[PDB]
């Protein structure tokens, strides 16, 4: 037996984002006791999935644990990535494949949100938290962001956590913002639940400036990014996919 890890990010065309994702995945390798480890990306950035998978095979891997670097569960985890996996794996029918889950609802990621809150330096006890995800038409995305909000609610003595979204599913973060123009003395933290900055993050920044014009007790944290606790959660995913102790991550054909 020879085990491999194939990390799969979604990929970016922004050079800085490519570099950050690649460096994160590279820094994961020293934490995994597996002799063959390759990084790959679905799109816009190579190594491609095909390249990384074939590299794993060429180095003698009998088992490949494919682990997607994804915060939430949507089309990429269910369709695009598995489709590329089946396309390349069809050529090596003797190689056993396991395929992991996105990070999703994990206590470590809640800790990442908590530390982003703490970084502001404002008391958070009995404060409101507004957790902004990108959003998706896939209901699993809203469900998981809500689960993270509930876990934060259980773990930190905040007043409440409001999951909301930039697009595709409700409630939209602008509706929450419009409802927060009051200023009732309650502090509101805005946590962008995103791996990278970019257009939508810039939009959040501008909208939070507008909101602060109405309600000065509003504080925007930096986006989650590749926080150390995000790394802990992702390493959990990697280890469970490689262990595959019950076969629950077996890469079975058919539509996901």
CSV table of C-alpha atoms in Angstrom, one decimal:
chain,number,residue,atom,x,y,z
A,1,UNK,CA,0.0,0.0,0.0
A,2,UNK,CA,1.1,3.6,-0.7
A,3,UNK,CA,-1.2,6.4,0.3
A,4,UNK,CA,-1.4,9.8,-1.4
A,5,UNK,CA,-3.2,13.1,-0.6
A,6,UNK,CA,-4.5,15.1,-3.6
A,7,UNK,CA,-5.5,18.6,-2.4
A,8,UNK,CA,-7.9,20.4,-4.7
A,9,UNK,CA,-8.6,24.1,-4.4
A,10,UNK,CA,-11.2,25.8,-6.6
A,11,UNK,CA,-8.4,28.0,-8.1
A,12,UNK,CA,-8.2,31.7,-8.8
A,13,UNK,CA,-6.9,33.9,-11.6
A,14,UNK,CA,-5.8,36.7,-9.2
A,15,UNK,CA,-2.1,36.1,-8.7
A,16,UNK,CA,-2.1,36.9,-5.0
A,17,UNK,CA,-5.0,34.5,-4.4
A,18,UNK,CA,-3.2,31.8,-6.4
A,19,UNK,CA,-0.1,32.3,-4.2
A,20,UNK,CA,-2.0,32.3,-0.9
A,21,UNK,CA,-3.9,29.1,-1.8
A,22,UNK,CA,-0.7,27.3,-3.0
A,23,UNK,CA,1.2,28.4,0.1
A,24,UNK,CA,-1.6,27.2,2.4
A,25,UNK,CA,-1.8,23.8,0.7
A,26,UNK,CA,2.1,23.5,0.7
A,27,UNK,CA,2.2,24.3,4.4
A,28,UNK,CA,-0.4,21.6,5.1
A,29,UNK,CA,1.9,18.8,3.9
A,30,UNK,CA,4.2,18.7,6.9
A,31,UNK,CA,1.2,18.0,9.1
A,32,UNK,CA,0.2,14.8,7.2
A,33,UNK,CA,2.1,11.5,7.6
A,34,UNK,CA,1.6,10.6,4.0
A,35,UNK,CA,4.5,10.1,1.5
A,36,UNK,CA,2.8,11.3,-1.7
A,37,UNK,CA,1.1,14.7,-1.5
A,38,UNK,CA,0.1,16.9,-4.5
A,39,UNK,CA,-1.8,20.1,-4.8
A,40,UNK,CA,-4.2,20.9,-7.7
A,41,UNK,CA,-6.9,23.2,-8.7
A,42,UNK,CA,-10.3,22.8,-10.5
A,43,UNK,CA,-9.9,26.0,-12.6
A,44,UNK,CA,-7.9,29.0,-13.6
A,45,UNK,CA,-4.7,27.7,-11.9
A,46,UNK,CA,-2.6,24.7,-12.4
A,47,UNK,CA,-1.5,22.1,-11.4
A,48,UNK,CA,-4.8,20.8,-12.8
A,49,UNK,CA,-6.7,18.0,-11.1
A,50,UNK,CA,-5.5,15.7,-13.9
A,51,UNK,CA,-1.9,16.7,-13.4
A,52,UNK,CA,-1.9,16.2,-9.6
A,53,UNK,CA,-3.8,12.9,-9.8
A,54,UNK,CA,-1.4,11.6,-12.4
A,55,UNK,CA,1.5,12.8,-10.3
A,56,UNK,CA,0.1,10.8,-7.4
A,57,UNK,CA,-0.2,7.7,-9.6
A,58,UNK,CA,3.3,8.1,-11.1
A,59,UNK,CA,4.8,8.2,-7.6
A,60,UNK,CA,3.3,4.8,-6.9
A,61,UNK,CA,0.1,5.7,-5.0
A,62,UNK,CA,-2.3,2.8,-4.6
A,63,UNK,CA,-4.8,4.9,-2.6
A,64,UNK,CA,-5.6,8.6,-3.3
A,65,UNK,CA,-7.4,10.8,-0.7
A,66,UNK,CA,-8.9,13.7,-2.6
A,67,UNK,CA,-9.6,16.6,-0.2
A,68,UNK,CA,-11.3,19.7,-1.5
A,69,UNK,CA,-10.2,23.1,0.0
A,70,UNK,CA,-13.7,24.5,0.3
A,71,UNK,CA,-15.5,26.3,3.1
A,72,UNK,CA,-19.0,25.2,2.1
A,73,UNK,CA,-20.8,22.5,0.1
A,74,UNK,CA,-22.2,23.5,-3.3
A,75,UNK,CA,-21.8,22.6,-7.0
A,76,UNK,CA,-18.0,22.5,-6.9
A,77,UNK,CA,-17.9,19.8,-4.2
A,78,UNK,CA,-20.9,17.9,-5.6
A,79,UNK,CA,-20.3,18.1,-9.4
A,80,UNK,CA,-17.3,19.9,-11.0
A,81,UNK,CA,-14.6,18.4,-8.8
A,82,UNK,CA,-16.0,14.8,-8.8
A,83,UNK,CA,-16.5,15.0,-12.6
A,84,UNK,CA,-12.8,15.9,-13.2
A,85,UNK,CA,-11.9,13.1,-10.7
A,86,UNK,CA,-13.9,10.5,-12.6
A,87,UNK,CA,-12.5,11.7,-15.9
A,88,UNK,CA,-8.9,11.2,-14.8
A,89,UNK,CA,-9.4,8.2,-12.6
A,90,UNK,CA,-11.1,6.2,-15.4
A,91,UNK,CA,-7.6,5.7,-16.8
A,92,UNK,CA,-6.3,4.0,-13.6
A,93,UNK,CA,-9.0,1.5,-12.5
A,94,UNK,CA,-6.7,-0.2,-9.9
A,95,UNK,CA,-6.3,3.0,-7.8
A,96,UNK,CA,-8.6,3.3,-4.9
A,97,UNK,CA,-10.0,6.8,-4.3
A,98,UNK,CA,-11.5,8.5,-1.3
A,99,UNK,CA,-13.0,12.0,-1.5
A,100,UNK,CA,-13.6,14.3,1.4
A,101,UNK,CA,-16.1,16.9,2.4
A,102,UNK,CA,-15.8,20.7,2.6
A,103,UNK,CA,-14.9,22.1,6.0
A,104,UNK,CA,-18.5,23.0,6.7
A,105,UNK,CA,-19.8,23.1,10.3
A,106,UNK,CA,-16.7,22.6,12.4
A,107,UNK,CA,-15.9,24.0,15.9
A,108,UNK,CA,-12.4,25.1,14.7
A,109,UNK,CA,-13.9,27.4,12.1
A,110,UNK,CA,-16.2,28.8,14.7
A,111,UNK,CA,-13.0,29.6,16.6
A,112,UNK,CA,-11.7,31.4,13.6
A,113,UNK,CA,-14.8,33.5,13.5
A,114,UNK,CA,-14.4,34.2,17.3
A,115,UNK,CA,-10.8,35.3,16.9
A,116,UNK,CA,-11.7,37.6,14.0
A,117,UNK,CA,-14.3,39.1,16.4
A,118,UNK,CA,-11.7,39.4,19.2
A,119,UNK,CA,-9.2,41.1,16.8
A,120,UNK,CA,-11.4,44.2,16.8
A,121,UNK,CA,-10.6,44.9,20.5
A,122,UNK,CA,-14.2,45.8,21.4
A,123,UNK,CA,-16.2,43.9,24.1
A,124,UNK,CA,-18.2,41.1,22.5
A,125,UNK,CA,-20.3,40.0,25.4
A,126,UNK,CA,-24.0,40.3,24.5
A,127,UNK,CA,-23.1,41.7,21.1
A,128,UNK,CA,-24.7,40.9,17.8
A,129,UNK,CA,-22.7,39.1,15.2
A,130,UNK,CA,-23.6,39.3,11.5
A,131,UNK,CA,-22.0,36.4,9.6
A,132,UNK,CA,-21.9,37.1,5.8
A,133,UNK,CA,-21.4,34.3,3.4
A,134,UNK,CA,-21.4,34.5,-0.4
A,135,UNK,CA,-24.6,32.6,-0.7
A,136,UNK,CA,-25.7,30.0,-3.3
A,137,UNK,CA,-28.9,28.6,-4.8
A,138,UNK,CA,-27.7,25.3,-3.3
A,139,UNK,CA,-29.5,25.1,0.1
A,140,UNK,CA,-26.6,23.3,1.7
A,141,UNK,CA,-24.7,26.6,1.7
A,142,UNK,CA,-27.3,28.5,3.7
A,143,UNK,CA,-27.8,25.5,5.9
A,144,UNK,CA,-24.1,25.3,6.8
A,145,UNK,CA,-23.6,29.0,7.3
A,146,UNK,CA,-26.6,28.8,9.7
A,147,UNK,CA,-25.0,25.9,11.4
A,148,UNK,CA,-21.8,27.8,11.9
A,149,UNK,CA,-23.9,30.8,13.3
A,150,UNK,CA,-25.6,28.4,15.7
A,151,UNK,CA,-22.3,26.9,16.8
A,152,UNK,CA,-20.9,30.4,17.4
A,153,UNK,CA,-24.1,31.2,19.4
A,154,UNK,CA,-23.5,28.1,21.6
A,155,UNK,CA,-19.7,28.7,22.1
A,156,UNK,CA,-19.5,32.5,22.6
A,157,UNK,CA,-21.8,34.6,24.9
A,158,UNK,CA,-23.1,36.9,22.2
A,159,UNK,CA,-26.6,38.3,22.0
A,160,UNK,CA,-27.3,36.6,18.6
A,161,UNK,CA,-25.7,35.5,15.3
A,162,UNK,CA,-27.4,36.5,12.1
A,163,UNK,CA,-26.3,34.5,9.0
A,164,UNK,CA,-26.9,36.4,5.8
A,165,UNK,CA,-25.6,36.4,2.2
A,166,UNK,CA,-24.2,38.5,-0.6
A,167,UNK,CA,-26.2,36.8,-3.3
A,168,UNK,CA,-28.5,33.9,-4.5
A,169,UNK,CA,-30.2,33.1,-1.2
A,170,UNK,CA,-31.8,35.1,1.7
A,171,UNK,CA,-31.6,37.0,3.8
A,172,UNK,CA,-29.4,39.4,1.9
A,173,UNK,CA,-26.9,41.2,4.1
A,174,UNK,CA,-28.2,44.6,2.9
A,175,UNK,CA,-31.6,43.8,4.5
A,176,UNK,CA,-29.9,43.0,7.8
A,177,UNK,CA,-27.9,46.2,7.5
A,178,UNK,CA,-31.0,48.2,6.8
A,179,UNK,CA,-32.5,46.8,10.0
A,180,UNK,CA,-29.4,47.8,11.9
A,181,UNK,CA,-29.5,51.6,11.3
A,182,UNK,CA,-31.0,52.1,14.7
A,183,UNK,CA,-28.2,52.4,17.3
A,184,UNK,CA,-29.8,50.9,20.4
A,185,UNK,CA,-26.5,50.7,22.3
A,186,UNK,CA,-25.9,47.1,21.2
A,187,UNK,CA,-22.6,46.3,19.5
A,188,UNK,CA,-22.7,44.6,16.1
A,189,UNK,CA,-19.7,42.8,14.7
A,190,UNK,CA,-19.7,42.0,10.9
A,191,UNK,CA,-17.7,38.9,10.0
A,192,UNK,CA,-17.2,38.1,6.3
A,193,UNK,CA,-17.1,34.3,6.0
A,194,UNK,CA,-14.8,34.3,3.0
A,195,UNK,CA,-11.4,32.8,2.1
A,196,UNK,CA,-10.2,35.7,-0.1
A,197,UNK,CA,-10.8,39.4,-0.5
A,198,UNK,CA,-12.0,40.8,-3.8
A,199,UNK,CA,-15.1,42.5,-5.3
A,200,UNK,CA,-17.7,41.3,-2.8
A,201,UNK,CA,-15.4,42.0,0.2
A,202,UNK,CA,-14.9,45.5,-1.1
A,203,UNK,CA,-18.6,45.9,-1.4
A,204,UNK,CA,-19.0,44.8,2.3
A,205,UNK,CA,-16.5,47.4,3.3
A,206,UNK,CA,-18.3,50.2,1.5
A,207,UNK,CA,-21.7,49.1,2.8
A,208,UNK,CA,-20.4,48.9,6.4
A,209,UNK,CA,-19.1,52.5,6.1
A,210,UNK,CA,-22.6,53.5,5.0
A,211,UNK,CA,-24.1,51.6,7.9
A,212,UNK,CA,-21.6,53.2,10.4
A,213,UNK,CA,-22.9,56.5,9.2
A,214,UNK,CA,-26.2,55.5,10.8
A,215,UNK,CA,-25.1,53.2,13.7
A,216,UNK,CA,-21.6,53.9,15.1
A,217,UNK,CA,-21.7,50.7,17.2
A,218,UNK,CA,-20.8,48.5,14.1
A,219,UNK,CA,-17.4,47.0,13.6
A,220,UNK,CA,-16.3,45.0,10.5
A,221,UNK,CA,-13.7,42.3,11.0
A,222,UNK,CA,-11.2,41.1,8.4
A,223,UNK,CA,-12.4,38.2,6.3
A,224,UNK,CA,-11.8,34.7,7.7
A,225,UNK,CA,-9.1,33.8,5.2
A,226,UNK,CA,-6.6,31.0,5.9
A,227,UNK,CA,-6.8,31.5,9.6
A,228,UNK,CA,-4.9,29.0,11.8
A,229,UNK,CA,-8.2,27.5,13.0
A,230,UNK,CA,-9.4,27.1,9.4
A,231,UNK,CA,-6.1,25.2,8.9
A,232,UNK,CA,-7.0,23.0,11.9
A,233,UNK,CA,-10.4,22.3,10.4
A,234,UNK,CA,-9.0,21.5,7.0
A,235,UNK,CA,-6.4,19.2,8.5
A,236,UNK,CA,-9.2,17.4,10.2
A,237,UNK,CA,-10.9,16.9,6.8
A,238,UNK,CA,-7.6,15.6,5.3
A,239,UNK,CA,-7.0,13.1,8.1
A,240,UNK,CA,-10.5,11.8,8.1
A,241,UNK,CA,-10.5,11.4,4.3
A,242,UNK,CA,-7.1,9.5,4.4
A,243,UNK,CA,-8.3,7.3,7.2
A,244,UNK,CA,-11.7,6.6,5.6
A,245,UNK,CA,-12.2,4.3,8.5
A,246,UNK,CA,-15.8,3.2,7.6
A,247,UNK,CA,-15.5,3.7,3.8
A,248,UNK,CA,-17.8,6.7,4.2
A,249,UNK,CA,-15.5,8.8,1.8
A,250,UNK,CA,-15.3,6.1,-0.9
A,251,UNK,CA,-15.5,7.8,-4.3
A,252,UNK,CA,-18.6,6.0,-5.7
A,253,UNK,CA,-19.7,6.8,-9.2
A,254,UNK,CA,-23.0,8.4,-10.1
A,255,UNK,CA,-24.4,11.9,-9.5
A,256,UNK,CA,-23.7,13.5,-6.2
